[PDB]
Every structure is written in structure tokens, then in C-alpha cells.
């Protein structure tokens, strides 16, 4: 158990965000075109958010390039992705020079447990039905039982 | 001595030359079946016959294929037992003939002892005793032994034995 | 004769017709290939009528089953 | 996010000599291979079942 | 009820079975195609001076091109490149017959003759398919027990004392007294002539040692590539260099590619005095070197011809000898690193001056003992031993764009393209993978360090700014069609008055010599007046931009297709993952863009195929070329999943991305391919997306296009899986199309094209053919 | 039987390392003559234009299948072997141009009795198939199937090869009590035996 595994060299560096920002947002930008994110994914929002904790002037700038160049005449996903789009620099713009923020979105889940007639036990992560925001997910915490 | 399973080689050698009343040296491997017997075509088909019985499975146009190709093709599915054809063949070699005395379970453990030659070694010898039918009247048992010593050399010529 | 002597519907006119036919055996190939045929002629010929079996010496695996 | 850094490095909890070789390596200057680090919060969540 | 009950209830299910695809280029209809080119673009080009890529292949640590390109876009197989690799690599043969007696006829394991089915080979293979292909620890096997953990070499060492004698041939004996003089006592032995050679105190001798060398991992050919696999048989693969196998392969593999199985089809359309093979190599035949500086001093058993097999342009010509037997252009460069780009460049000016209508562009480049060694003492490769100090894992050893890179990872292999005449293309209708916009190379500066890459192909870019306040109308493409219509107006109005000028002439000739003398002369009208159609479509259309300092090549290219610099999405850099070239080449480019008038936050999404692959040498710009090509067709643009951490000092440059992961795009416009090889050999070539090309052409023209490429397709397929599963995929030409006796008479005549003889059914020259009126 | 008696003469007669060479160069006479004399016809024929089972698409041979087994006038499969021949022809189409694990869309042959309902089901489900020729080892596979010998030998001559007397000359007896089962209902194209005398 005790050998010693740690070493200064083998330390890895991550440290390149200006650049993963407009990857993971020419990722969005197909993949909303690509009907893979839609207008009721929450996954837009939450990558929205990381977006915009790496906001910039050359974030700004291929942003502001990408969406004015988008073309909302060749179909439905396109305009949506070019509304969305001066929406997020609008944003991106409003959050420049402010602390990045953790900021979860997730859909707060809640244990189920089924038994089908084969008696196939099953466990799902099932959305909650009255708790939909963290918001509301402190408010049942802070109301207790 | 280590056992062998008889070849498909060596039995539609035998069943092919016994059928022929010719000895097993005077018909070549390296000939089609329609080259033997062309004279006859009731010969023809009674091989074939004989040879579907012992083999089970034969291939597409058997007679103008010739005899080699054809050992490999049993070969295959084939697996070392005596069958049905080559059974009745030794039971009428060994009743039909004079061992008064001696049947075909005595002439099995008698090679077995002494030679040392185990059973896919005994139908192999009991091939080239078929091949060789001695036909006219033998006297008793001490020619049988010495015909079962000269068979049990050719086995071991044509195959590549040592006793 | 094959084929005009398989069919059991032309063996049976012959053999009811009051003459021996044989239902020939090259134009089946299966055991119950022939015993369907036979009980088809059967049902169709009047009792005490007789008819023959014809099997080619040239096909030895029908001749291993027929 | 923007300025944020993630440094890996492999581990092992239960050796002794990995600890404070960690914490030199954060605490050591960047000219001497450390990090120069001063750490504000630990989460020490290592476990084995 | 019975098992009769649930029995029909029971439902068969349908596994599927691997159908490798040649995944020919998809063309759309001429109505939406119509749509992506402008108007003014139809009928301006000159289709005779537009260089498409036609059929693209490879052979690399990942096996063919499609394997490499589904390992590349996606990190994983498929199940019909899963079936792929385990054929390539012989873990799977194809049996058809009796197999252990049920008749059997599909893959069963090339070791155990056991049935495998398709489902079954990715669970069965995979995990031997991943770990012996792509960057791994050298595997002696695979270079003559080449063990860089155990490197032999041979030390000079003067003996103290009189050696033991030992028996020596006579021969042996009289060479080693003329080698050593006095210092060794030879003697005949009278009872067999044999001899004994005791060497004297003092003597010359050699021991071997070892030496651990620390380079232990590399980009090898996967385990298991077997040329006879391909259908090449044991004369060749015994008299050529395993460069020559990757090469023959290779250039195969891009004629299936191409639609092209038999390549004497090619010259049922043009001479064999037109399809040049411009291939070339950084090193070439490096085991026959091995063979005649090494093997010949130790008098080691080699072949008597060893020399010929160790030229670079030796390769291309076992080509020419066994698939092609074309008199048409030879020229092999040598571009070290960059090679593959400069042959691209060579083949482009072959088509453009039309000496040759076809060309066989590409690098190749193999890896050995020596040539690792000699890069280990340059610290040029990464440092392996430094790498394992890091857990760092051989596939992730070559970093590109990466803080951390420390050299390039070094690889082996052959990237092959066929580069034809637009209008040959489409005449012969042949896929159409891309257009080679433009191909070019320039040498940096002067300097005093050979490997130091320098900003030489940013020359592409110049042009000259001193006055750029209104826009030039050459940039406009309707003031240079109305050019166009203006200049035909005239040719036709000089083609009618050459039509009554002939008629006058004619008239004096009397009326038995009038037929020939017309025919004679109206296809000399003809021939000019098309010359002077394409002169005018050359002059408007392709090179309108030659003579304009205003515009700068990279950017007329551009233009030619009326793209705009910004449409130019994906360009494939070098990335060799070295400190020097990393940061060079990406400012290099980041001031091509800069200098073009890039539109602002418009970065070139940067694509580095060196981190899957590793660096094939001569071969590197070949493999980028055909990722490239698949880029353009797929609209996919792989990630550079190694670059874990992009350096920080590549920031600065504002138009380049380092993606991590593949990107699904909407569509890829063209494609930037830019090297750097050693000795100041910079290289860039822009490629464009085939759909534009259409454009320039007419619904009829493309339409028997499309049939003509269907029916092509169809037959490559057929041909391809034929060949796969017999492996016969490469069939070496047996004679030359052309008998000896009619061979002079064939190349004298610069219209002869072969035909079907009826006896042999094969392409042939026929005599009937040779200088006929028809 | 007067091509029968030709191809008697001059290529059964050869010996078996010139038959190949000689079959070969004769093709396209003895696919002529195979269309429009023999009761068997060259099976890789479309709109009476000669071709091969290499230049062959799925969905011509599935239809060709149902020409030459499938009889129109009496609306029900020849034999049930032939049937299951198809059948299983479809069942490899399915096999190769899917693209996971899925159902059989023939889970029983009792649904071929409708051929061309089955046939346009099952390339409507694998469109690829239309215009894809057959893949080299489905050609070698349907050669195999050709050759079982638990089925009613096949009314027609797949491909020439050693082995095309066999194709030529098995089972070329019942063809004349069925004239329906024949290519054009032609007597002249089958094989009835006869007395000279009688």
C-alpha cells in the first residue's frame, strides 16, 4: 500500500481556458444546429454559464463573427441558434470583467426504485416533481420535515 | 507400438481392389474409377455403393475424379472406425475362410500381443488380408498365424511401420 | 419410366386399367418421398390390383434407402 | 473558467513520504520545480472501501 | 401448450456482417449544387488548368486510410473498420470450401482455422488490434531484432596477448594477411588444405558491446502487415525494400480509391506520355543503405543489386515497372519532412505546363536503427526515458501545440494521392474528392542552423498595399465574365473569317485533293479555335491573378472559386509537437491570416493528425493531404485529442484554434495543408471542396458525370472486395500494354489509345489505332 | 438437347485443365445460347442483357430469384426448398446492409407465398441494396447454397466454372411433366426422352 507513487514531474498543467471557451462554444453552436441541443435542453443553459465564466474581448469577437455570419434562412435550427447567439454576447458582454461564477442549473433528481412483473429490480434517477431548481432544492432543505 | 486409425486412403484402396479380385499393388491410386471398370457399368455403381456405405457422404461425379483426391475428401468427415461395409467384409473373410479353430476377437489379440499392434493397427492389417485373399483352401491354423505375420509386413511396407 | 411412371395418379389408371405398371423410383428422392406415392397409388387402385417398383442401377444411394 | 488552473498529479494517501512531498511540491518555489503555492482549503476525501 | 406454442413466438434475429465501403464523395443535385457556386462561375474556368484529387490512400500505424480517418475523427472502430484492421493485420483470412466437414464460407482465424463471425471480431480482436498498431514500443520483429534497449555496436580494441589459432578457409586466410600484415601466422594444414590463423599480440580486432539507447517507442506499421496479403508475390517482396511494399500498396489502394483497377484504363483517355508519377521520399531505401554500409563491411549475405533499391526515385520507378508503364514525366523531390507537399507542387506545374494530364503525387518514408540513432543525437524525437519519468504513455508521447511537447514521435509509412485534369476527370468520371487550389514552397532566409524552421511559405501571402482605397474590379468575377464574353465574341467572329478564308483557299484547289485538303484544314480551325477559348478562360478564369500585385496567390486561388479568405475554416498544421515548429508555424500563419484582412474573431480551426500518427518524415504532408480530403467530404474536423494543455504562448495568435475533440461542422469550405521540413523546405498547398468545381459545369455535363461516377463506383466496389477477401487487390501488370514492336510507333503517335482485344479481353494497343484518321 | 449434344462435343469431351480456358473464351456464346435454348438460363441476366453476379445488385437477383423459381400462373412457389433458398438469400441482404443487432423481417418463409411483398418490405428497410452490386463473399456464399445438396438443384446456371456440367446437366428430367417452371413454357428449351422406333 505505501509505495510511493508521487512524483513533481509526472504533475499535469491545465491552465489553457482562453481557448476551451470558444471550442466548447463552437461545440453549442452545431450542436444546437445539429438538433442535438434544443430550446428545453438544460445542457444549453449549463453550457451557457461555462461560457461566459471565460468571457473575453476574442471570446467577444468570435462570437460577435460566428452569429452575424449564421444564416437563419436555411432552416428553424439556425435562426434559433443565431437568436440565441446575439442573446449570449449580449450576456457575455454584461459578465466582462466580473468574478466567473459556479452557478448549477442541474435538475435536482430524487431515488426511485421499480420492480417489473419479472421482478427485474431497477434504480432511476427520476426529476423530482416538486423540487425543478436548486432554488426551490434550499427551500425544502430550509423548511426541513 | 502407438495405434493409428485406418487412413480413407488405405480403405477405398482395399474396397476398390477386393471388388476387382486384384491384388492391392496391380490397381494404381492415380487413375479415375471410369478408367477401372469402363468395360462394365453395373461395377461401376456397386463401387460407388459400397464405397457410400462404408464413407456415408460421397462427392459430386465420384467415377471421373481419380481415387487420391478422393481419400482427402472422406478423410475429412471420415473418423478411423470400420463402419458397416468393411464389417460384414471381415466377418466373411473369417467365416467364409477356414480358422476353424480362431475368429475375428482371437485374430485381433494375437496381432495386439504378438506384434504389439493396437486396434487402428489391427484394421489396417485386416485390410491388407482382405487385398490378398488367399481364396483356395488353407489347411488350419499355423498357415493362418504365418499369412497374419506376411500381412502384418505389408501393412508396415506400404504404410511405414517397423515390427 | 421416369418421369411419366412416378406420377401414382398414372399407375393407379393402369393398374385399376387391368395391366401391370411399375411406379418408378429415379423420380423421388426421399423414403417417405416414395411411401407418400405408394399410399397415393393404394388409395386410388380397387383391391387385389398389383403394380411393381422400377429402381435404376445407376444411383446407388436410392438404392440404399428404396 | 477564466484564470482557473487544475493540476493532476498521482498520489498515494497511505504513504507518509508522499504527504509532505505534496506539500513541499505545493509550497516550493516555481524556479525550484514546486508550484509556489499558498493553499487557502483542503479536501481530504481520499477513502478506500 | 406445448413448446409448438413459444417456438413461433421465438424470433430470429439478424447480426449484422461488415460492408467496407469505398465512400466515394456523395454528389448532390445539380439543382442544390447550382446554389453554393455564384453565377458567373459556370463556363469560366478552364476546366484543362483545375487540379482535383481523385483517390487518396495510405499506408501508417493505422493501416488503410478509412481505418486511420475512423481512429482520427471518431477514437474508435466500427464494426466494418474493426473487420478491416483484423485483415489487415491477419488475425482474419476469408476460407471458402469444407471447413472441419459443415461447408463453410466467410472469416475463420488465420492461426486456428476456427469460424469468427463479423459481430464477433471486435469482442474477439480489438484488444490485440489497438495495442499492436499506432505509436508503441519498438517491436524488433518488425526491423531486423532492432532492440533499442540492446543497441549493438562494434568497438576498436588492440590485443595484449597471441590469440588461440581457429580454422580459416584459404580465402579467409590470404585476406586477413593482406588486412593485418605481420600480426597474424597463418598455416596450411596438409591433411585437408584447410588453414589455421592464429592472430599475434597486437593485432586489430573488434568486440561488440551493447548500449541502452533511450528512443523505445515509435509510429510502426501495425503488427501482422503483410505485402502478399495485398496480392504481392515473393519475387518481389524478395528483391525490393519494405519502403517499395508501403509504396506499390499505397498507390494501389488510391487507384481503388479512384475507380481506376486496371491503371491501362487511364489510357483509353490520354497517352502514356501523359501520366506523370512525381512521388518522392526524404530518405528512401534505408535498409539497402543498412544492407551495403553495414552487412557489406561485416560481408554479411546481401542481394548484388542492393545499391539500386536504396534511390528515392527507385520506388516510384518499381511503379512504373509493375502497375503503370508510363513514359510519361519522372521527377522525385526531396523535401526531408515537407516532401509529400513539394511532390503535390511538382505534380501541379506537370498538369499546368500539360506535359501530363495524371500524376501520382505523395511522400514515403521508412523508420530504422540508424535514422532513430542519428534524430536521438540531433534531439529532434522526444526523449522517451524523459517522457516515462512524466507517466507519460507511448500513444501520448507526440503532444502538438502542447506546453509540454519536447519533439516529434517517429513514424513509418506511404500517403499516396492521384491528382488529375478537371475536364479528364470529368470525362472520365472519376470521384472528385477536391480541387489542389494552389501548391507552393519557398526557403526561408539565410542562417547557420539547418533544422531551424523559418517564415518562408508566408511569401504566399505577399502583396503589395501602398494603394487599397477602392476595391480592384478583378476582384468582382462579373467584370471578368464579361471580359470573357467580350473575348469568345471575338474568337467566334475569328473562327467565321477563318471559316470564308479556308472556303477561298479551297476553291483553288482542285476538287479530288478538296475533301482531304478541307478535312485537312478544319480540324487545324478547330484546334485553334478551342486554343484560343481556353487561352481566354486561362487568362480570366484561373490566372487572372498572376500579373495583379494587389492580390496575393493564396488569396486568387481563393478567388478562382469566388471564395473570400474567411470561407478557408480548417487549415492542418504541421504539428510536430517540437518547441521550434509549434510556435513558428502557428505565428507563420497567424500572419498569413492577419495580412489577408481575416475577418476579426475568425480563427482557422487547427488540425494536428501528427498526434494519432506520429511523423512518417517524407511521407508527414501526404497524410494531411488525405485527412485533409476527408475533412472537406465529412464536414468533420478532428480534434487534437493529445493537445491536453495548449500553450500559453500561442495565445497571441488570434486566428488560430487548438480544438480537443472532433467537431461536426455544417460544412468545410477548403483546407490549408502547410509543412516545414529540414534544410529551410517550406511547403503549403490549399485544397477546396469538390461541390464548387460542379458549379463551373453544365446540368448535362454533370449529370453523365454522376451516371458515368455511379456505374464507376459500383465496379471499384465489386473489384475492391474481390481482391480483399482473394487478396489479389494488387496484380502486377504480367507485359506493357503495347507489344516491343509497336512500341516506338505507339509513343510517336500522340493519339493512340488502347482497346479491348476480343482473345484476351485486357486494354492493348491495337495497330488499326496507331497514327489512324479516325 | 441439340445444344446438349454440342456442348457433348466440344467442351464436356475436354480434359479438365482445358475446360476452364475453353469456357472462359466461349462465355458469351454459351450465355447466348444458355438464354435462348437451354431450359436452365444464365442466371445473371436483366432485361435480357447478359451480365455476371459480381455486376449483379441485390434487388436484381432477389427478382431474378422469384423469375426463375416463383411461378406466376399458379401464384405459389415451384418447390418449398426453393422457397427457403430465397428466403435465406433475403435473410443475408438483412445480415449485411443492417447496421446492429435487430429482427428477421421474414420471420417465417409461409410470408414469401406474396414474393414481391416481401421482396419491396425488405429493400424498403435496406435502400443501400438497390443499387449496391453483391459483395464478393455473398457471391461465394450464394454459389454454396447452389451447391446443397438438400434442395431441389436450381432451374438455372449460376456460373461457369469446372464444375459447369453438373449446373448443365442435373436434374433435366421433370422440366417437361412442368412447362410452367420453364423459361418461356417452351418445350424446345427441355429434355424428353423418347424412343427412335416407338
Given at each position: 500500500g505505501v509505495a510511493t507513487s508521487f512524483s513533481r514531474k509526472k504533475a499535469r498543467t491545465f491552465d489553457s481556458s482562453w481557448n476551451w471557451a470558444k471550442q466548447s462554444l463552437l461545440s453549442l453552436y452545431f450542436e444546437i444546429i445539429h438538433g442535438v441541443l434544443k430550446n428545453v435542453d438544460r445542457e444549453v443553459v449549463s453550457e451557457a454559464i461555462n461560457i461566459m465564466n471565460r468571457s473575453n474581448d476574442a471570446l467577444i469577437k468570435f462570437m460577435e463573427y460566428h452569429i452575424s455570419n449564421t444564416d437563419e434562412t436555411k432552416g428553424e435550427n439556425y435562426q434559433l441558434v443565431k437568436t440565441l447567439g446575439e442573446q449570449l454576447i449580449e450576456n457575455c458582454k454584461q459578465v466582462l470583467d466580473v468574478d466567473p461564477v459556479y452557478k448549477d442549473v442541474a435538475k435536482p433528481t430524487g431515488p426511485k426504485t421499480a420492480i417489473d412483473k419479472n421482478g427485474n429490480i431497477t434504480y432511476s434517477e427520476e426529476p423530482r416533481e416538486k423540487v425543478r431548481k436548486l432554488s426551490q432544492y434550499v427551500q425544502e432543505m430550509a423548511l426541513g420535515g | 507400438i502407438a495405434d493409428e486409425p485406418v487412413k480413407a486412403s488405405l480403405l477405398l484402396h482395399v474396397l476398390v481392389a477386393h471388388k476387382l479380385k486384384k491384388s492391392l499393388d496391380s490397381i494404381p491410386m492415380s487413375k479415375t474409377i471410369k478408367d477401372l471398370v469402363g468395360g462394365k457399368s453395373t461395377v461401376q455403381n456397386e463401387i460407388l455403393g459400397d464405397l457410400g456405405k462404408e464413407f456415408g457422404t460421397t462427392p459430386e461425379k465420384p467415377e471421373e475424379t481419380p481415387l487420391e483426391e478422393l481419400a482427402e475428401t472422406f478423410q475429412d468427415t471420415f473418423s478411423g472406425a470400420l463402419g458397416k461395409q468393411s464389417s460384414s467384409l471381415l466377418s466373411r473373410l473369417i467365416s467364409s475362410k477356414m480358422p476353424g479353430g480362431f475368429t475375428i476377437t482371437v485374430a485381433r489379440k494375437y496381432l495386439q500381443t ?5 486396434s487402428g493397427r489391427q484394421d489396417g492389417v485386416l485390410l491388407v488380408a482382405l487385398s490378398n485373399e488367399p481364396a483356395a483352401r488353407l489347411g488350419s491354423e499355423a498357415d493362418a498365424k504365418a499369412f497374419l505375420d506376411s500381412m502384418a509386413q505389408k501393412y508396415a511396407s506400404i504404410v511405414g511401420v517397423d515390427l | 419410366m421416369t418421369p411419366c411412371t412416378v406420377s401414382p395418379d398414372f399407375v393407379a389408371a393402369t393398374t385399376n386399367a387391368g395391366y401391370t405398371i411399375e411406379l418408378a423410383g429415379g423420380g423421388y428422392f426421399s423414403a417417405a418421398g416414395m411411401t407418400a406415392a405408394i399410399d397415393s397409388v393404394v388409395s386410388q387402385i380397387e383391391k387385389g390390383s398389383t403394380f411393381g417398383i422400377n429402381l435404376i442401377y445407376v444411383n446407388p444411394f436410392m438404392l440404399q434407402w428404396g | 473558467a477564466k484564470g482557473s488552473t487544475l493540476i493532476v498529479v498521482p498520489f498515494n494517501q497511505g504513504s507518509k513520504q508522499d504527504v509532505e512531498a505534496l506539500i513541499e511540491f505545493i509550497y516550493d518555489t516555481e524556479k525550484n520545480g514546486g508550484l509556489g503555492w499558498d493553499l487557502d482549503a483542503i479536501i481530504p476525501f481520499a477513502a478506500i472501501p | 401448450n406445448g413448446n409448438s406454442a413459444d417456438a413461433a413466438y421465438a424470433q430470429v434475429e439478424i447480426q449484422p456482417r461488415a460492408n467496407i465501403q469505398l465512400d466515394f464523395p456523395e454528389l448532390k443535385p445539380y439543382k442544390q449544387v447550382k446554389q453554393i457556386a455564384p453565377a458567373e462561375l459556370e463556363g469560366l474556368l478552364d476546366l484543362e488548368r483545375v487540379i482535383v484529387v481523385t483517390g487518396f490512400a495510405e499506408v501508417g500505424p493505422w493501416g488503410s486510410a478509412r481505418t486511420r480517418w475512423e481512429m482520427e475523427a471518431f477514437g474508435e472502430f466500427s464494426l466494418e473498420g474493426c473487420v478491416e484492421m483484423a485483415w489487415i493485420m491477419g488475425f482474419i483470412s476469408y476460407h471458402n470450401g469444407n471447413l472441419k466437414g459443415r461447408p463453410y464460407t466467410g472469416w475463420v482465424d488465420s492461426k486456428t482455422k476456427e469460424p469468427v463471425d463479423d459481430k464477433d471480431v471486435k469482442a474477439k480482436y480489438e484488444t490485440s488490434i489497438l495495442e499492436h498498431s499506432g505509436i508503441r514500443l519498438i517491436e524488433p520483429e518488425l526491423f531486423n531484432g532492432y532492440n533499442p534497449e540492446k543497441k549493438e555496436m562494434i568497438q576498436e580494441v588492440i590485443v595484449e596477448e597471441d590469440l588461440e589459432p581457429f580454422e580459416a578457409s584459404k580465402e579467409t586466410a590470404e585476406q586477413f594477411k593482406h588486412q593485418h600484415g605481420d600480426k597474424v601466422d597463418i598455416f596450411e594444414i596438409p591433411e585437408t588444405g584447410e588453414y589455421s590463423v592464429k592472430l599475434l599480440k597486437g593485432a586489430t580486432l573488434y568486440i561488440p558491446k551493447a548500449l541502452r539507447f533511450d528512443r523505445l517507442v515509435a509510429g510502426q506499421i ?5 505485402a502478399k496479403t495485398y496480392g504481392i508475390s515473393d519475387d518481389i517482396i524478395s528483391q525490393v525494400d519494405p519502403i517499395t511494399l508501403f509504396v506499390l500498396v499505397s498507390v494501389v489502394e488510391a487507384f481503388i480509391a479512384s475507380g481506376i ?6 489510357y483509353k483517355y490520354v497517352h502514356v506520355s501523359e501520366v506523370g508519377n512525381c512521388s518522392g521520399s526524404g530518405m528512401g531505401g534505408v535498409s539497402a543503405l543498412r544492407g551495403m554500409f553495414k552487412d557489406r563491411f561485416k560481408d554479411e549475405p546481401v542481394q548484388n543489386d542492393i545499391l539500386q533499391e536504396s534511390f528515392i526515385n527507385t520506388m516510384s520507378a518499381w511503379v512504373n515497372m509493375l502497375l503503370i508503364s508510363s513514359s510519361g514525366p519522372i521527377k522525385t523531390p526531396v523535401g526531408a519532412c515537407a516532401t509529400s507537399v513539394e511532390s503535390v507542387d511538382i505534380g501541379v506545374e506537370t498538369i499546368l505546363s500539360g506535359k501530363a494530364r495524371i500524376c501520382i503525387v505523395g511522400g514515403y518514408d521508412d523508420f530504422q536503427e540508424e535514422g532513430s540513432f542519428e534524430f536521438g543525437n540531433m534531439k529532434a524525437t522526444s526523449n522517451t526515458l524523459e517522457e516515462f519519468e512524466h507517466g507519460r504513455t507511448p500513444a501520448e508521447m ?6 509540454t511537447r519536447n519533439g516529434f514521435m517517429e513514424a513509418q509509412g506511404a500517403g499516396i494521392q492521384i491528382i488529375m485534369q478537371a475536364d479528364l476527370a470529368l470525362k472520365m468520371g472519376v470521384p472528385i474528392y477536391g480541387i489542389v487550389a494552389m501548391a507552393a514552397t519557398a526557403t526561408d532566409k539565410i542562417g547557420r542552423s539547418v533544422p531551424a524552421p523559418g517564415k518562408g511559405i508566408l511569401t504566399t501571402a505577399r502583396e503589395h498595399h501602398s494603394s487599397v482605397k477602392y476595391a480592384s ?5 462579373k467584370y471578368r465574365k464579361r471580359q470573357l464574353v467580350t473575348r469568345e465574341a471575338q474568337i467566334k467572329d475569328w473562327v467565321e473569317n477563318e471559316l470564308e478564308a479556308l472556303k477561298l483557299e479551297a476553291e483553288e484547289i482542285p476538287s479530288e485533293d478538296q475533301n482531304e485538303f478541307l478535312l485537312e484544314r478544319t480540324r487545324e480551325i478547330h484546334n485553334e479555335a478551342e486554343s484560343q477559348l481556353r487561352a481566354a478562360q486561362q487568362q480570366w478564369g484561373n490566372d487572372f491573378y498572376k500579373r495583379d500585385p494587389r492580390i496575393a496567390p493564396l488569396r486568387g486561388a481563393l478567388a478562382t472559386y469566388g471564395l473570400t479568405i474567411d470561407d478557408l475554416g480548417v487549415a492542418s498544421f504541421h504539428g510536430t509537437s517540437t518547441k521550434a515548429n509549434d510556435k513558428n508555424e502557428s505565428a507563420t500563419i497567424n500572419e498569413m491570416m492577419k495580412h489577408l484582412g481575416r475577418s476579426e474573431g475568425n480563427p482557422v480551426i487547427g488540425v494536428f493528425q501528427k498526434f494519432l500518427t506520429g511523423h512518417p518524415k517524407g511521407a508527414a504532408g501526404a497524410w494531411m493531404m488525405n485527412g485533409a480530403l476527408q475533412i472537406l467530404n465529412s464536414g468533420i474536423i478532428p480534434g487534437n485529442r493529445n493537445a491536453d494543455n495548449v500553450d500559453k504562448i500561442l495565445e497571441q495568435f488570434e486566428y488560430v484554434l487548438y480544438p480537443s475533440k472532433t467537431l461536426k461542422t455544417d460544412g468545410v469550405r477548403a483546407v490549408s495543408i502547410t509543412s516545414f521540413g529540414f534544410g529551410q523546405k517550406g511547403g503549403q498547398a490549399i485544397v477546396v471542396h469538390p461541390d464548387y468545381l460542379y458549379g463551373a459545369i453544365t446540368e448535362d455535363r454533370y449529370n453523365e458525370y454522376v451516371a458515368k461516377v455511379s456505374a464507376r463506383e459500383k465496379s471499384a466496389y465489386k473489384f475492391f472486395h474481390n481482391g480483399m477477401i482473394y487478396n489479389k487487390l494488387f496484380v502486377s501488370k504480367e507485359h506493357a500494354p503495347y507489344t516491343d514492336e509497336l512500341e516506338e510507333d505507339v509513343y510517336l503517335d500522340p493519339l493512340a489509345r488502347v482497346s479491348k482485344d476480343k482473345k484476351s479481353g485486357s486494354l492493348t494497343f491495337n495497330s488499326k489505332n496507331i497514327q489512324s484518321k479516325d | 438437347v441439340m445444344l446438349w449434344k454440342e456442348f457433348d462435343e466440344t467442351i464436356f469431351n475436354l480434359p479438365k485443365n482445358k475446360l476452364v480456358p475453353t469456357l472462359e473464351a466461349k462465355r458469351d456464346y454459351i450465355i447466348s445460347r444458355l438464354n435462348a435454348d437451354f431450359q436452365k438460363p444464365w442466371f445473371a441476366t436483366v432485361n435480357g442483357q447478359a451480365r455476371d453476379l459480381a455486376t449483379m445488385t441485390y434487388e436484381e437477383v432477389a427478382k431474378r430469384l422469384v423469375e426463375l423459381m416463383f411461378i406466376r400462373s399458379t401464384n405459389s412457389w415451384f418447390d418449398v426448398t426453393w422457397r427457403t433458398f430465397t428466403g435465406d438469400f433475403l435473410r443475408r441482404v438483412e445480415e449485411r446492409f443492417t447496421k446492429s443487432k435487430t429482427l428477421s423481417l421474414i420471420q417465417s418463409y409461409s410470408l414469401l407465398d406474396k414474393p414481391d411483398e416481401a421482396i419491396e418490405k425488405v429493400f424498403n428497410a435496406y435502400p443501400a441494396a438497390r443499387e449496391q452490386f453483391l459483395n464478393a463473399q455473398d457471391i461465394d456464399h450464394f454459389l454454396s447454397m447452389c451447391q ?10 449460376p456460373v461457369l466454372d469446372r464444375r459447369f456440367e453438373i449446373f448443365f446437366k442435373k436434374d433435366s428430367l421433370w422440366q417437361s411433366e412442368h412447362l410452367e417452371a420453364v423459361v418461356d413454357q417452351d418445350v424446345q428449351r427441355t429434355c424428353i426422352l423418347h424412343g427412335p422406333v416407338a
Open positions: - | 504378438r506384434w504389439g499392434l493396437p | - | - | 501495425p503488427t501482422g502487415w503483410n483497377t486496371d491503371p491501362y484504363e487511364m507526440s503532444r502538438p501545440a502542447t506546453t474590379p478583378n476582384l468582382n468575377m | 446443397n445438396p438438400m434442395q431441389k438443384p436450381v432451374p438455372f446456371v
